[PDB]
Amino acid sequence: SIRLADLAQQLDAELHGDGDIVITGVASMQSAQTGHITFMVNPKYREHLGLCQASAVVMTQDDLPFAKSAALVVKNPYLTYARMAQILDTTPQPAQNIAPSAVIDATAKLGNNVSIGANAVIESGVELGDNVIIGAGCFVGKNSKIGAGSRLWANVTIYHEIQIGQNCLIQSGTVVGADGFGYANDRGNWVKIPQIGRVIIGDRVEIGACTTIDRGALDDTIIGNGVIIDNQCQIAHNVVIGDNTAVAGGVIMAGSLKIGRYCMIGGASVINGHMEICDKVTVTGMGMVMRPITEPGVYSSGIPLQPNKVWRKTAALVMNIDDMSKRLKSLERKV
Amino acid sequence: GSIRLADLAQQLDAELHGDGDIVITGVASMQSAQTGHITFMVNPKYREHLGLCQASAVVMTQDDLPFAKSAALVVKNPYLTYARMAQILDTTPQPAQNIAPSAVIDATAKLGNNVSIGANAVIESGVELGDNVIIGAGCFVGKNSKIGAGSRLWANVTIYHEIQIGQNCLIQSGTVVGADGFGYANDRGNWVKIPQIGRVIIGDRVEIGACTTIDRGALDDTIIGNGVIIDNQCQIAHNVVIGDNTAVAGGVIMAGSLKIGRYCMIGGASVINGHMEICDKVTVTGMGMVMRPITEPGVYSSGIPLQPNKVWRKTAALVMNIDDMSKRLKSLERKVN
Amino acid sequence: GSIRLADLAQQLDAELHGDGDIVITGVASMQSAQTGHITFMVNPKYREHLGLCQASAVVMTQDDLPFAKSAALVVKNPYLTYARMAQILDTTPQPAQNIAPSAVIDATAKLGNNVSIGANAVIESGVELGDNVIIGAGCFVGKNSKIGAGSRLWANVTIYHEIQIGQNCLIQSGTVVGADGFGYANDRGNWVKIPQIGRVIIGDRVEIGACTTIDRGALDDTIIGNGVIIDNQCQIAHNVVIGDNTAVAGGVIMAGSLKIGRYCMIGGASVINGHMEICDKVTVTGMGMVMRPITEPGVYSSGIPLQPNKVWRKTAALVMNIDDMSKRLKSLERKVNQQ
Ligand SMILES: CCc1ccc(CNC(=O)CN2C(=O)[C@H]3CCCCN3c3ccc(C(=O)N4CCCC4)cc32)cc1
Ligand SMILES: CC1(C)CC(=O)c2c(nc3nn(-c4ccccc4)c(O)c3c2-c2cccs2)C1
Ligand SMILES: CC1(C)CC(=O)c2c(nc3nn(-c4ccccc4)c(O)c3c2-c2cccs2)C1
Ligand SMILES: [Mg+2]
Ligand SMILES: [Mg+2]
């Protein structure tokens, strides 16, 4: 709980209203009650701010006339919302102190104020930086290193020789460092190629739940600083992802793809390997990426939904489009 | 547990034709059935095949009965009766029995009657587990979460904090409920985390497959209606709402703030955009590319299916250049007219 | 782990050119290799670059040998020799060693010789673990399941009940074998669960990646043949049958009751519908949308690739209206036919 004046100061916002108001938490505009701070970005909500029951509303200067409550004026309400939600965050920590049921190899090196949850398993040679938090049921494999401030939720699996930077966050069920999909072929028989590269994860990386990031075959899979990766993603061996790139849920990336900085990969896209995508590329959802991308911009693929009766005709005509093409050429020749 | 055929027929509301004293030990497919097994016939083309089935009894319709070569249970709906008798004769174990000494249970957790918790499961402060709840081995249930009576988690399920799960739910292994939604503000190209302080509310009789992820809401909640069934490896983003009785097949990806109505059917591997609505009674066939809201009930589809690679090469190239084909068509129309 | 180059050459059946007494300590890429490392060359474009490689030895072909600037192992197939030498020099640790005191093992479980069970793993009643089986930390192995000799599970793998796994398999973390198939009946508008009482049978030498799910069958079994390799995030539905030596790349979804033959290659993110068969020696390229049976071997493909968004918008609009284009083409043909 925090006085509105003090909150406004920490957000570098201009206060319009009683600075003595006590703010206890953040809420959506439709759910906000007395004690809550909320925000608005869409001008459509201006007309009904009189129905919002928040104690304060983060808004722009052009919104201030429509205010029906204390208001904090800022240039970017959504970014200010991110910041105030962090000040008023209620999320608990994955663990506190070291649980007696945790199994920690005696050669593990632990920094100051490391927390390890119940039944977590820490292997030999592991290094955990200051303030690292390991959730219940996690596994951290041999000689892996987790930088200061990084946090793993429950039931995360980190394999051996993995490097994670500072202030990272990994959600439950994620697996970092499994074998890449590497095999030779000896007369129809698959021959396993041991995958003895690593994963290097930079600083301030956030990884979602049930995402898999494979280790490299010889050299490393590399995740840049500030990257965010959603749930159910697959990052194959020797993929390199540049700083501040965002990957939405269910994206599948094949081996040895290189993605630049500040990219945005829409959910359920499929990115083929041994190719590069330059900085500042957006791929919209379900994008089928087969070729390198060398110019920044927005790229898309796929034929959208239709009523089933219509789709049947659309698909049949497309599958026979070579015959249409030939008939068009014949007609041009005749005319 | 074995049961007399007459007693089984009674519990199934079926007309017994044959020896009610036969002892049934389990359910089997028609081709696999042996003595002591009960099976079922849904396809009347197998009528001439019943003499090759070695089951002790067969569920069938009244029209099938003249063709029987075994004791028969006559019902209106053999498939539904099979579902029911397989529940009566189910061999599936429970995820746990009693409370394992290796489980780690906070002193403030509130356990109802007849709760079972498997080895090395971890139960946080404030958790409430209703009567007859079963938590499998290695699960994690986070702070203040509530799981209603009769619900069951298989092994290695993760439930985060402040999650509400209804009665008689079933969650398969590897599933994660309540992780942070994909919420970040952009500050000059750097991502700023938005804490996700909403929850997940799961209704009654919900079934969730393995390695599915259901994220908590940003402020308000992600909501799963009653009777919903969700298959393996689906992604349900923050603040998605799924209406009662909707079925979501395997591998479906949903973006944030999608609302799906009641009684929908979402085919496997579909991809659904966020911040929009799908009305009641919508079916999307598999691999559907759902970009826009769906405002009318019925069946919807997308995608260009497989061809021989040599053929696909031409199809893909021609579609990619379809604007040029369109212009050539227009030009030829003008030249002819 | 270190080995004399001469001894390594013998084990690889390679012709040594250079000092057999060199001590090799590991494998590395050409770019990263240092003293004590062995590397390999598959692309003759790097011949002019070998003076920059600081490996102690390089695996190459006879045609490469005049370009060597180091000890060389000459072979017919550098890529396969690389696979074999990486196994000889593998640094990958085991998922576990010995039986962890924190493991929870039912009294009726049967263990063979030299079994290792990692910390906090849970082994149910009736489970059978063969000789040299390794179960990683945090695994669950359900009632009456059987894991054959030499098979290994990494950490946090879940095996349900009545599952059978053969010899020398390897399963990566987060994978779930034997969950309920997606089976339900309909009672006047309510879903009714169909208990899934079939099993999963996994053959010998199967490798399964991470966070893959393989559901048990409804009555009869889900079957994975010998030598099959399956990547991460795959979904194998109830009653799927996969034939020997087939490869399934990452993120593939297979619907119920699909049968896939032998020596198939299923590209990443493909979607294969059910109640149908794919014959032997079929390749489906990435993101393939498989709606019909495949009865002839060969390569099959689907999907319209990426374009710039403004171009895509026009492509998509024209395709969605292709029925009107077809009607206009037929009308024009009639006019040109003088009808
Ligand atoms: C890195 C984050 C990010 C990358 C790219 C974009 C570009 N915007 C889109 O691609 C919008 N979009 C669609 O048009 C259609 C395409 C056909 C399939 C269904 N559908 C989509 C499915 C999932 C997502 C998705 O993952 N999102 C949307 C909210 C945030 C994540 C988006 C979409 C936006 C955001
Ligand atoms: C719920 C039910 C008892 C009935 C049902 O309708 C259904 C079922 N199983 C499915 N598997 N797949 C699937 C899975 C993987 C890849 C491709 C497809 C579907 O699309 C499925 C559907 C649906 C069809 C159309 C909309 S939902 C079982
Ligand atoms: C099994 C093998 C040793 C050889 C192989 O054939 C193969 C391999 N790795 C792959 N990754 N992806 C992939 C992954 C993610 C997104 C898109 C594509 C494929 O499609 C892959 C394929 C195949 C190509 C065509 C059919 S299978 C390695
Ligand atoms: Mg997918
Ligand atoms: Mg323990």
Automatic annotation (TrEMBL), chain B:
Residues forming the catalytic site: H238 (proton acceptor)
GO cellular component, one term: membrane
Keyword Repeat: yes
A GO biological process held by the record: lipid A biosynthetic process
Record field: transmembrane: none
Free-text function comment from the UniProt entry: Catalyzes the N-acylation of UDP-3-O-(hydroxytetradecanoyl)glucosamine using 3-hydroxytetradecanoyl-ACP as the acyl donor. Is involved in the biosynthesis of lipid A, a phosphorylated glycolipid that anchors the lipopolysaccharide to the outer membrane of the cell.
Protein name, entry field: UDP-3-O-(3-hydroxymyristoyl)glucosamine N-acyltransferase
Organism field: Escherichia coli
UniProtKB/TrEMBL annotation, chain C:
EC number: 2.3.1.191
Reactions this protein catalyses: UDP-3-O-[(3R)-3-hydroxytetradecanoyl]-alpha-D-glucosamine + (3R)-hydroxytetradecanoyl-[ACP] = UDP-2-N,3-O-bis[(3R)-3-hydroxytetradecanoyl]-alpha-D-glucosamine + holo-[ACP] + H(+); a UDP-3-O-[(3R)-3-hydroxyacyl]-alpha-D-glucosamine + a (3R)-hydroxyacyl-[ACP] = a UDP-2-N,3-O-bis[(3R)-3-hydroxyacyl]-alpha-D-glucosamine + holo-[ACP] + H(+)
Domain of life: Bacteria
Active site, per annotation: H238
Top enzyme category: transferase
Gene3D superfamilies in UniProt: 1.20.5.170, Hexapeptide repeat proteins (2.160.10.10), MurE/MurF, N-terminal domain (3.40.1390.10)
One of the GO biological process terms: lipid A biosynthetic process
Keywords: Acyltransferase, Lipid A biosynthesis, Lipid biosynthesis, Lipid metabolism, Repeat, Transferase
UniProt GO molecular function: N-acyltransferase activity; UDP-3-O-[(3R)-3-hydroxyacyl]-glucosamine N-acyltransferase activity
Domain UDP-3-O-[3-hydroxymyristoyl] glucosamine N-acyltransferase non-repeat region: 21-87
Pathway info: Glycolipid biosynthesis; lipid IV(A) biosynthesis; lipid IV(A) from (3R)-3-hydroxytetradecanoyl-[acyl-carrier-protein] and UDP-N-acetyl-alpha-D-glucosamine: step 3/6
GO cellular component terms attached to this protein's record: membrane
Subunit structure and binding partners: Homotrimer.
Function: Catalyzes the N-acylation of UDP-3-O-(hydroxytetradecanoyl)glucosamine using 3-hydroxytetradecanoyl-ACP as the acyl donor. Is involved in the biosynthesis of lipid A, a phosphorylated glycolipid that anchors the lipopolysaccharide to the outer membrane of the cell.
HAMAP family with a match to the protein in the record: LpxD
Similarity remark: Belongs to the transferase hexapeptide repeat family. LpxD subfamily.
PANTHER family: UDP-3-O-ACYLGLUCOSAMINE N-ACYLTRANSFERASE, UDP-3-O-ACYLGLUCOSAMINE N-ACYLTRANSFERASE 1, MITOCHONDRIAL-RELATED
Name of protein: UDP-3-O-(3-hydroxymyristoyl)glucosamine N-acyltransferase
Species annotation: Escherichia coli
Source lineage: Bacteria, Pseudomonadati, Pseudomonadota, Gammaproteobacteria, Enterobacterales
